[PDB]
Structure formats: C-alpha cells, structure tokens
Write a protein that binds this ligand. Structure first.
Ligand SMILES: O=C(O)c1c(CCCOc2cccc3ccccc23)c2cccc3c2n1CCC3
Length: 152
C-alpha cells in the first residue's frame, strides 16, 4: 500500500474518530499534510450529506449487523466486500463506504466500544485500497477525490 495506504488510513481514521467524538484532532499530518486536510474537509461535507440522505439504509444495515463487540467489528470485512465489490466503482460509493464507517463509529461510541474504532478504520482502509487500488491510482488518489468534489 505504501503512501496511498498510509494517507488513506490517516484520512479514514481521523474522519471516523472526529465523527465519533465531535472533537477535532490536533496532531500534525505526516506527508502531503495539505492534501490530507483538504480531503478531510471534503469528507465532512459530502460524507455528512450521505449520512443524512441514507439514514434509513444506514440504520437498517447497522441493525442487521448486530455489532456488540471487538469480534463483531473484526468480522465485518467480508460483509464490506460483499456489498462494495459488486458493481461499479465510483467516488460516490467510496464516500458511502467511509461515511457509513463513520456511522458505525458513532454507534460504537454509544456502546463504549470506542477502542474498536481504530481497527474499524484499518479494516475499511484495507478493503478500499486492496480492492480498488488500480482505480484509485488512475484517479490520482485523494487529490483526485478532492478535485471531484471541488465546488468552484
Ligand atoms: O457500496 C455501496 O454502494 C453501499 C455501501 C458501502 C459498501 C458497504 O459498506 C459496508 C458494508 C458492511 C459493513 C461496513 C462497515 C463499515 C463501513 C462500510 C461497511 C453501503 C453501506 C451501508 C448501506 C448501503 C451501502 N451501499 C448500498 C446499499 C446500502
């Protein structure tokens, strides 16, 4: 994964953590911090929108997932792939994946399984980067992500 993986994990982890706790993290970004911060801002905008519009579906999937513990979270990867790996690859679906990740994170905060949020992010990142790698590189990665949702 290297740089694309590191950057993906940092963005997804910060977004899920921020979404769960309502507090902004204060530590500096590794490399290309400018792009990670821009991607995070983009994610707050479009991701909060997708969580608002897909509330019914997100609730249904979360209920279906019956997440109660570290094992339940550790078990999600094949379900993520089950939905995500079928169909067309586009930024909207990637956003659906991450923003739903945030939704689950908020739910883990509710049941005091916040420790589970970091592996969840690690799991989402692994799913995204491993399965959609060539598509992401082709799209210029997170820079492409930002440019796709740039509101001029
Ligand atoms: O890939 C999609 O278009 C997609 C996605 C994104 C891919 C599947 O994402 C997940 C599926 C299962 C568990 C997940 C846990 C954390 C983050 C994402 C997870 C959806 C997520 C929740 C609900 C729906 C989702 N859809 C479409 C139908 C309704």
């Amino acid at each position: 994964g290297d740089e694309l993986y590191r950057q993906s994990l940092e963005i997804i982890s910060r977004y899920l953590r921020e979404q769960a706790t309502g507090a902004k993290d204060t530590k500096p970004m590794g490399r290309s911090g400018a792009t990670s911060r821009k991607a995070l801002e983009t994610l707050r905008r479009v991701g909060d929108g997708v969580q608002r519009n897909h509330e019914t579906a997100f609730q249904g999937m979360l209920r279906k997932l019956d997440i109660k513990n570290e094992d339940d979270v550790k078990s999600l990867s094949r379900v993520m792939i089950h939905v995500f790996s079928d169909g067309v690859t586009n930024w909207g679906r990637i956003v659906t994946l991450i923003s739903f990740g945030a939704f689950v994170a908020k739910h883990l905060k509710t049941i005091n399984q916040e420790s589970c949020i970091e592996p969840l992010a690690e799991s989402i990142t692994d799913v995204l980067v491993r399965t959609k790698r060539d598509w992401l590189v082709k799209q210029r990665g997170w820079d492409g992500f930002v440019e796709f949702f740039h509101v001029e």
